[PDB]
UniProtKB/Swiss-Prot annotation:
Natural monellin has not been mass marketed to the food industry, primarily due to the challenge of large-scale purification of the protein which is relatively sensitive to heat or acid treatment. The lineage of its organism: Eukaryota, Viridiplantae, Streptophyta, Embryophyta, Tracheophyta. This is Monellin chain B. InterPro entries: Cystatin_sf, Monellin, Monellin_B, Sweet-Taste_Mod_sf. Heterodimer of an A chain and a B chain. Keywords: Taste-modifying protein. Taste-modifying protein; intensely sweet-tasting protein.
């Protein structure tokens, strides 16, 4: 089980804000207005495959409501620099 459901608290809500912010720069859905992240928020941890198998970072799967539409966002997050990248942002997706 590489995936782990995490809370949808302020940190996760801000992850959804990052997703909508990046989705707006992408422009695939035009200007979106972040509303909230809903359950479930899944986090997968990515490890070094060599040595002490340290954590490279994380990838999240978020269901983000933006402009009254439900989107599925996938975000990578580096472990050391916390720099985040929007991997995928698809919608409208069915309610999870």
């Amino acid at each position: 089980g590489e995936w782990e459901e995490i809370d949808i608290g302020p940190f996760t809500q801000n992850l959804g804000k990052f997703a909508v912010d990046e989705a707006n720069k992408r422009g695939q859905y035009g200007r979106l207005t972040f509303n909230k992240v809903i359950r479930p928020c899944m986090k997968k941890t990515i490890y070094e495959n060599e040595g002490f198998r340290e954590i490279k970072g994380y990838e999240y799967q978020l269901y983000v409501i933006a402009s009254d539409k439900l989107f599925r966002a996938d975000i990578s997050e580096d472990y050391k620099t916390r720099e985040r990248k929007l991997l995928r942002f698809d919608g409208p997706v069915p309610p999870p």
